[PDB]
């Protein structure tokens, strides 16, 4: 029995992690029933093969591989080197060789100028001795068929796929080959009742395939392409099975902590959420819409209790509740299940498309995804760009009240508001924007400007907004940009901070330093403004301002906001399940700038991890990075290069932001290198 799952599978590692129940298959009693095949080297071979062939034909050939049949390649040297190899140790020559050549190879003479061996060598080719051969001019289908029957397949090239590669004559003879991928040395497995492999094969009428219909949900690119092609060619001859089916067929006759190893904390499980917008405005109900939420981590769902029942998402105030904000905040948007277009949420209680009560129905997909955004090479300050009307205050307040493990991640002091640059000038940017109106003919007041630019439906005329931008852009680029530049330059001094902006071009024109993120929201931001009362210049002015910023932004696809909160929260929440019991003295750490004259030390990064991980961290070259500290409210500046992220770990979830302060006197600018001042235990 063979089952293919849409994830990379390895013989030793994927077993330790609950890969099957990372999808949802229980598989209670192991009983040595499930077995895994290593397919990583197959993926590497596929990547290498992509350098000489189309993806489609390579995939098509690879599909026909039988994974329950054992076979392997046998790399050979080039011909000229093969003969000279046979000259040394003339005991490996196959019996198929011409007797004249064999007799001449054992001559024990130098054979430099034999002048008869020359002709014999010239009129010789490898195919005369080895029947199945691949010579870099062979279709992949031929290779797959050759491995399908027979145990040894001979080849004169390393660009082959499907199985391991063994060596013929010692490495000295192979000079054209340099890759060290999986080429086994000259030195030289059964099947369980079930077998799990990444790839799906059609070599048998009943090689099963996992659910695998959620093509978009597959994280890895290569696996996604493989599955897409397979179902786009052979849709009607596949045996699709669901996790419940797998659980049954594993636990048929039997039903009636991952051991101890290093644990990654940036692998989280997410599910698709199905629900609807039932309206109970009267004693009866409605089924107005059916929607889906895409990337909801399981840790959050288990943390704050989520059953399947008739949930209400509004309080007496009239606005949305906090937990619903967080839940929608951690996802990748919504989608209507009838029309497959994107969906956006109306926050206010305004008749068109109101959401008051919802009812959960079920959870369909489940897979593990990496959380590292992969643009996090170095530990740098973070700048997030959100449009106006994005619940900034609510998000900040909710984030501040998170004290998971005695560290209080994301404090209010470590975040800077978008508008903070605004009041640096005694006349803020906003009143200058208000006064813009004087530069427009036919407009005598800000109110006149508002009624001029809008068309009674709160829509810019798409031309008058043109001259609004014409007048507004010089103000921004001549006044806001320099003050923003100084503001960010000073802000970097106090340490790592979370920065919010309204358009990325603000940060670009201010020469901002650090990771840049453009994030969007699954809501109608514009409607969020005019309901928010107690505005200074009127809500309509805020609408016009938001339109101006949106036009000011660059052309770049903004990711979902959840990609940030997931990294901010989920690793810590997962690690709490492991460290929540141990002694904090041993399972804690601290990274900071060292300055000799008790001793000067200012914290930089806070580390929490198990004892073994911290001990491994203890021996690292923390002295390689230097900075200049000046002075409790101390502040420093890094010279050279910033700290690479992998130096921390793929383990040991840490703090994204920090504030510089000296623990208990002349102002000094001595020097700094950072040291692993974590702890003794």
């Amino acid at each position: 029995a063979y089952i293919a799952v849409p994830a990379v599978v390895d013989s030793r590692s994927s077993e330790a992690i609950g890969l099957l129940e990372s999808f949802g298959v229980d598989a209670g009693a192991d009983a040595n029933d499930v077995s895994y095949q290593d397919h990583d080297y197959v993926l590497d071979q596929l990547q290498y093969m992509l350098d000489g062939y189309e993806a489609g034909d390579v995939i098509d050939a690879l599909v026909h591989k039988n994974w329950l049949h054992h076979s392997v390649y046998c790399l050979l040297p080039p011909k000229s080197q093969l003969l000279e190899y046979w000259k040394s140790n003339p005991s490996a020559i196959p019996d198929n060789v011409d007797r004249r050549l064999r007799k001449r190879l054992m001559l024990k003479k130098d054979l430099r100028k034999d002048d008869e061996y020359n002709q014999l060598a010239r009129a010789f080719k490898i195919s005369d001795v080895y029947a199945p051969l691949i010579s870099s001019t062979t279709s992949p289908m031929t290779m797959i068929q050759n491995l399908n029957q027979g145990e040894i397949v001979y080849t004169t090239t390393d660009r082959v796929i499907g199985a391991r590669i063994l060596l013929y004559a010692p490495r000295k003879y192979y000079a054209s080959t340099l890759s060290f991928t999986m080429t086994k040395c000259i030195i030289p497995v059964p099947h369980s009742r079930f077998n799990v492999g990444t790839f799906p094969s059609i070599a048998t009428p009943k090689c099963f395939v996992m659910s695998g219909v959620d093509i978009e949900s597959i994280p890895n690119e290569f696996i996604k392409l493989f599955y897409q092609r397979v179902k786009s060619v052979h849709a009607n001859i596949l045996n699709d099975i669901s996790p419940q089916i797998v659980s049954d067929m594993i636990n048929r006759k039997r039903l009636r902590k991952r051991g101890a190893s290093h644990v990654d904390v940036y692998k989280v499980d997410v599910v698709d959420m199905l629900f609807e917008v039932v309206d109970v405005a009267d004693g009866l109900r409605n089924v107005s819409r059916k929607l889906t939420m895409h990337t909801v981590p399981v840790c959050i769902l288990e943390m704050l209790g989520i059953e399947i029942a008739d949930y209400c998402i509004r309080q007496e105030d009239g606005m949305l509740t906090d937990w619903f904000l967080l839940l929608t905040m951690l996802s990748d948007g919504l989608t209507d299940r009838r029309t497959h277009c994107q969906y956006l949420i109306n926050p206010s209680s305004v008749p068109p498309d109101v959401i008051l009560n919802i009812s959960i129905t079920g959870f369909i997909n489940r897979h593990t995804i990496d959380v590292m955004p992969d643009i996090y090479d170095f530990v740098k300050p973070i700048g997030a760009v959100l449009p106006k009307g994005s619940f900034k205050s609510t998000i900040m307040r909710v984030l501040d009240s998170i004290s998971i493990l005695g560290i209080q991640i994301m404090p209010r002091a470590h975040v800077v508001d978008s508008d903070e640059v605004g009041e640096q000038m005694e006349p803020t940017f906003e009143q200058a924007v208000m006064e813009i109106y004087k530069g427009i003919a036919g407009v005598d007041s800000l109110d006149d400007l508002i009624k001029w630019v809008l068309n009674s439906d709160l829509i810019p005329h798409d031309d008058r907004l043109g001259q609004l931008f014409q007048a507004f852009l010089p103000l921004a680029k001549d006044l806001l940009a320099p003050m923003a530049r100084k503001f960010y330059d000073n802000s970097m001094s106090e340490g790592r901070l979370l920065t919010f902006a309204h358009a990325d071009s603000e940060l670009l024109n201010a020469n901002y330093f650090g990771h840049l993120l453009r994030l969007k929201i699954p809501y109608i931001t514009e409607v969020n403004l005019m309901i928010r009362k107690n505005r200074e210049g009127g809500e309509l002015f805020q609408l016009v301002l938001s339109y101006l910023y949106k036009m000011y932004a660059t052309s770049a696809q903004p990711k979902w906001f959840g990609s940030l909160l997931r990294l901010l929260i989920c690793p810590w929440l997962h690690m709490e399940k492991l460290i929540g019991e141990a002694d904090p003295a041993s399972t804690s750490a601290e990274i900071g700038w060292h300055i000799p004259r008790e001793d000067g030390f200012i914290p930089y990064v806070s580390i929490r991890a198990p004892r073994l991980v911290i001990e491994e961290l203890m021996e690292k070259n923390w002295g390689q990075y230097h900075a200049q500290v000046i002075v409790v409210s101390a502040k420093a500046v890094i010279k050279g290069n910033h700290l690479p992220v992998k130096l921390v770990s793929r383990f040991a979830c840490f703090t994204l932001t920090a504030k510089y302060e000296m623990r208990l006197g002349r102002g000094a600018a001595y020097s700094a290198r950072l040291a692993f001042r974590s702890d003794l235990a």
Binding site: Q145, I241, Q244, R289, T339, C341, I459
Partner: protein
């Protein structure tokens, strides 16, 4: 300021799409998901409780009722129960078609289903526009059909161990919690201790029609091939699945004909084998009629219409495949070696060898352009390969220049390999241009004179008279040029043909040529040996020889020779002689091997060949136009009449390089020791392990299926030229325009794409243009005016038939879909009787022919009362009438004057003696149950309904129906305002199902006709009562066929 603005960027959608990726579609198309297996119950109708049973009660002790003993029941034990459609509510499928149709119990609102299509203008969430009811219903029916396209699966059985049945075999459902299914599948298995409704019904049934009925056990020790079982189901879905399986079975093939087809298509170079023994009835649905292939081919042509970027990558793909399979490869050094031997003097200012080698420059990458030129032969219908402008001499050249002579030589050898019909004229004019001033000929007119660029002559109309009639060229005044013209007429290559393909499996997509036939612009002559040797008896060899001889005559002409030194003349003629006898193997390859390779490759193309006849020099038969149509004109109905004036021309030229093709023609070599039957056996073997062709066949089937579904559906809301049934006219619908039809077609296309899991694009070319007059045809026209057209006679379509069947059924079971037929009557009725408002007593209703009624039309106008006089309104007969009696309104009349009418009539309706009948046709409805023993007034519901009517939307009609009782009860007054016009209460299933009988309120036993098999001892087991009554207990056929991959059963011999 709560003006509800900025709610318009909502649902308003987007249709414009940038579609530069036609190449990806053309090179590879997603396969439809045809075969799917359902292991659950083949049903879509669910009985649901509405009001919990009156248990315990003061009349009967609790020990009487069956529920008190925790006995499972086949039916809900409730005071009221109803039937609700819920597609695949019990299914257990492997692949989801994601097109479920689900309603709620009528006590729960269901309005959102009927506002799903075109109510983008509707504001309220509780309302819907009546004028799109028909469109919404059609969409609902289409999704209902699509969600049920499944094949029943054979699971397994087990003999009963209890005396409840006489040792029947009971089928076991998969999945968890299978306990509840056994009580639902087999109602007859229940015990009958009581006198209650359910027990009585069960006791009045036959006892041997349960469980497994018949089976076909072929192989001892394998799965039974199929079985027949008595189990809960519905006749409608059973019929749908039966016809679906019938279509699939018609599309079936078996391994033997598969190996025959594969052997045939490989021209005998590949041998494959099939097993010879009792099989297990695999299902391999790959055979379709030629008509579907032609339809798909025409659609595919219309995509690439007049665009070069869409077709060019296909040619590169074919070139790569040819280079992979062909045994011909470039000789690196042949030209240089043969030209290094010519003798010449070092004192000459010029050297012919230098010039020729400089112009040739054999960059070895020229065989790519040679291969694309070869591939062009298969698609002269849409692609016309031509020689690029840059190949011709810049200013026109001159015969005295050596460089121009070599350019003419290159062009002369390159031209005959292109598919351009106007090639020979350009070959002649190329020399004519160089020969101007030196030697003159008469031309047609002052525009296309002898000094035009040769490439300008591109159409048959520009063929010079002197070229078609040789005698006009003076043998004295123009010897060389007349000689060239004679050579062109006498030695231009002759087209031929060759047979290919495997029609009995692959069909044939040829349009203007006979099936199996593949045309070539070169005469094919099969080789009779497998060890080729050099030979000079070829068309192209003769062509090269004649060209060399013409150049040699030109050099030696006494009027031109004295301009050259004798040594240069000798060198030039020696070079020409060397070129004449070069040992290039390419002409042999083209004459003998290349047609075989093309015949092998062609059936496996993703885009099958599309050719028009090759004419050598018959200027009358040169094709001039190829067009397709997708619409029809205003009144024309017959496609053969509108095809001429409603076609769009299709085609695009492609530019090639003469230098590269000449290099290919001059420098071809074979492997040192070639044996064709071994080389091809080795090369072709892998490429017939590809199963893409069958996938393409399935895609082609779905294309025609969808086209027919589209036309049938559109023929409902509008008027078309095709005959069609019509059962949904009573449902109101707006006056459809072109935009409405386009939107409806977009919805249909989206639904079909979603159902079959297609990620590419379908039906899109038809969406452009008006979909109300679609028709498929193609034609081409010769120069002389004779035209040829092909009208593919549309085959059947199972989905359209099944959709129409479901529509016909809906004409009787509309209540089950939460739809009420007829009209409503608004008027106060106060009494203590318990008749259901859905089945009103006859005396309360009236209609247009009832005496003493008033009918109202478009002229609504009211005269207010003065000084106590009652207000009056104008009848349709011109009478002034007070606000009393019985009236009749078309509904739109109230929609357009909602507020005024409410304000004027609500008081009289509520308290006076006014009763109104509103004409609706069809409308969604809502139920509100109430306790008979308590006072109940329904004025609030009717008031809300009346006040919420909008000139765009109306809400669901509310009804107040009493709750049935099984024991004596008191009575209390009830005030009713809304009643239906005719019977609309077919949805109800049973009342007091767990009690001995119903005393008060509406009464209804189990519908006996729904269980005709059990209730009637004389009915044959396989009887159905469609389309009037859908049954709930049927005979279902469950299959266990295998669907192996092709390569699993047919394995080639390496």
């Amino acid at each position: 300021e709560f003006i509800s603005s900025w709610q318009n960027h909502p649902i308003v959608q987007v249709s414009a799409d940038v579609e530069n990726k036609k190449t990806a579609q053309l090179l590879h198309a997603d396969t439809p998901r045809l075969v799917t297996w359902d292991a659950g119950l083949c049903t879509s109708f669910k009985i649901v409780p509405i009001v919990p049973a009156q248990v315990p009660q003061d009349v009967l002790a609790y020990t009487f009722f069956t529920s008190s003993y925790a006995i499972q029941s086949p039916f809900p034990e409730a005071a009221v129960s109803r039937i609700v459609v819920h597609t695949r509510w019990a299914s257990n499928v492997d692949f989801d078609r994601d097109s479920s149709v689900i309603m709620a119990p009528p006590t729960e609102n269901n309005i959102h289903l009927f506002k799903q299509l075109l109510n983008t203008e509707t504001l309220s969430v509780r309302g819907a526009n009546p004028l799109m009811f028909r469109a919404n219903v059609l969409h609902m029916l289409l999704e209902f059909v699509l969600d049920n396209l499944y094949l029943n699966r054979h699971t397994g059985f087990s003999q009963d161990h209890t005396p409840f049945t006489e040792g029947a075999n009971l089928r076991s459902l998969p999945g968890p919690d299978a306990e509840k299914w056994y009580s639902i599948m087999y109602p007859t298995r229940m015990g009958t201790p009581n006198v209650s409704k359910i027990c009585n019904f069960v006791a009045s049934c036959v006892r041997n029609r349960v469980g497994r009925f018949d089976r076909a056990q072929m192989m001892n020790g394998a799965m039974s091939e199929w079985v027949d079982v008595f189990e809960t189901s519905d006749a409608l879905t059973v019929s749908i699945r039966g016809r679906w399986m019938a279509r699939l079975a018609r599309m079936n093939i078996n391994p033997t004909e598969i190996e025959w087809a594969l052997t045939e298509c490989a021209q005998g170079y590949v041998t494959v084998t099939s097993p010879y023994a009792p099989s297990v009835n695999r299902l391999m649905p790959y055979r379709i009629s030629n008509a579907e292939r032609q339809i798909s081919q025409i659609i595919r042509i219309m995509n690439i219409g007049n665009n070069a970027t869409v077709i060019q990558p296909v040619l590169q793909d074919i070139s790569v495949l040819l280079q992979r399979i062909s045994p011909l490869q470039i000789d690196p050094t042949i030209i240089s070696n043969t030209m290094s031997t010519v003798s010449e003097s070092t004192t000459q200012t010029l050297s012919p060898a230098s010039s020729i080698l400089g112009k040739l420059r054999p960059s070895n990458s020229d065989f790519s352009s040679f291969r694309v030129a070869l591939a062009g032969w298969l698609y002269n219908g849409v692609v016309t390969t031509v020689i690029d402008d840059s190949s011709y001499p810049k200013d026109g050249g001159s015969v005295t220049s050596l460089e121009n002579l070599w350019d003419f030589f290159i062009l002369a050898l390159a031209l005959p390999l292109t598919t351009d019909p106007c090639a020979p004229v350009k070959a002649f004019m190329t020399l004519a241009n160089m020969m101007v001033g030196f030697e003159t000929i008469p031309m047609d007119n002052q525009i296309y004179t002898q000094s035009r660029r040769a490439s300008a002559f591109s159409t048959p109309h520009t063929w010079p008279r002197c070229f078609m009639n040789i005698q006009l060229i003076s043998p004295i005044d123009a010897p060389i040029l007349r000689q060239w013209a004679e050579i062109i007429h006498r030695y231009w290559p002759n087209p031929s043909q060759i047979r290919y393909g495997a029609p009995n499996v692959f069909g044939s997509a040829n349009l203007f040529t006979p099936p199996e036939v593949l045309l070539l612009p070169i005469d094919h002559q099969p080789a009779n040996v497998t060890t080729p040797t050099l030979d000079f008896t070829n068309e192209l060899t003769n062509w090269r020889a004649r060209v060399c001889e013409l150049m040699k005559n030109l050099v030696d002409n006494q009027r031109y020779q004295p301009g050259w030194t004798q040594s240069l003349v000798s060198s030039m003629r020696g070079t020409l002689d060397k070129l004449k006898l070069i040992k290039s193997m390419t002409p042999m390859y083209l004459q003998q091997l290349a047609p075989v390779e093309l015949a092998v490759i062609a059936p496996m193309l993703p885009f099958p060949p599309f050719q028009v006849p090759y004419v050598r020099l018959d200027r009358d038969r040169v094709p001039t136009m190829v067009g397709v149509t997708r619409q029809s004109r205003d009144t024309i109905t017959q496609p053969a009449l509108s095809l001429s004036t409603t076609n769009t021309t299709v085609g695009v030229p492609l530019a090639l390089d003469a230098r590269a093709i000449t290099v290919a023609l001059l420098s071809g070599k074979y492997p040192p020791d070639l044996v064709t039957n071994v080389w091809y056996a080795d090369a072709i073997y892998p490429m017939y392990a590809d199963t893409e062709v069958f996938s393409n066949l399935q895609r082609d089937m779905i294309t025609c299926e969808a086209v027919q579904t589209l036309v049938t559906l559109v023929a409902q809301i509008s008027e078309t030229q095709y005959p069609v049934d019509r059962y949904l006219d009573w449902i109101p619908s707006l006056r459809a325009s072109a935009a409405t039809a386009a939107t409806f077609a977009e919805w249909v296309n989206t639904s079909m794409k979603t159902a079959f899991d297609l990620s590419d694009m379908l039906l899109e070319p038809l969406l452009s243009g008006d979909p109300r007059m679609t028709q498929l045809a193609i034609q081409y026209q010769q120069y002389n005016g004779r035209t040829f057209n092909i009208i593919p006679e549309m085959p059947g379509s199972v989905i359209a038939d099944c959709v129409q069947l479901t529509a016909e059924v809906f004409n009787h079971e509309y209540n089950l879909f939460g739809i009420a037929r007829g009209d409503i009557i608004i008027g106060r009725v106060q009494s203590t009787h318990l008749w259901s408002p859905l089945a009103p007593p006859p005396d309360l209703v009236f209609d247009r022919d009832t005496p003493g009624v008033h009918i109202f039309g478009r002229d609504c106008r009211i005269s207010f009362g003065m000084n106590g006089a009652a207000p009056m309104i104008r009848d349709e007969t011109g009478l002034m009438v007070p606000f009393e009696g019985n009236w009749i309104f078309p509904l739109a009349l109230w929609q357009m004057n909602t507020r005024y009418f409410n304000q004027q009539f609500d008081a009289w309706i509520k308290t006076g003696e006014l009763r109104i009948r509103i004409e609706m046709g069809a409308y969604p409805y809502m139920l509100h149950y109430y306790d008979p023993r308590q006072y109940a007034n329904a004025w609030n519901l009717t008031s809300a309904w009346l006040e919420e009517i909008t000139p765009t939307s109306i809400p669901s009609v509310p009804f107040m129906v009493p709750i049935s009782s099984d024991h004596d009860i008191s009575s209390a007054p009830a005030v009713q305002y809304i009643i239906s016009t005719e019977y609309n209460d077919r949805s109800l299933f049973c009342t007091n199902s767990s009690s001995p009988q119903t005393i008060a309120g509406p009464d209804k036993h189990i519908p006996v006709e729904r269980y005709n098999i059990l209730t009637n001892p004389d009915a044959p087991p396989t009887q159905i009562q469609l389309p009037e009554v859908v049954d709930l207990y049927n005979v279902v056929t469950r299959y266990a066929y295998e669907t192996p991959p092709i390569t699993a059963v047919v394995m080639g011999v390496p």
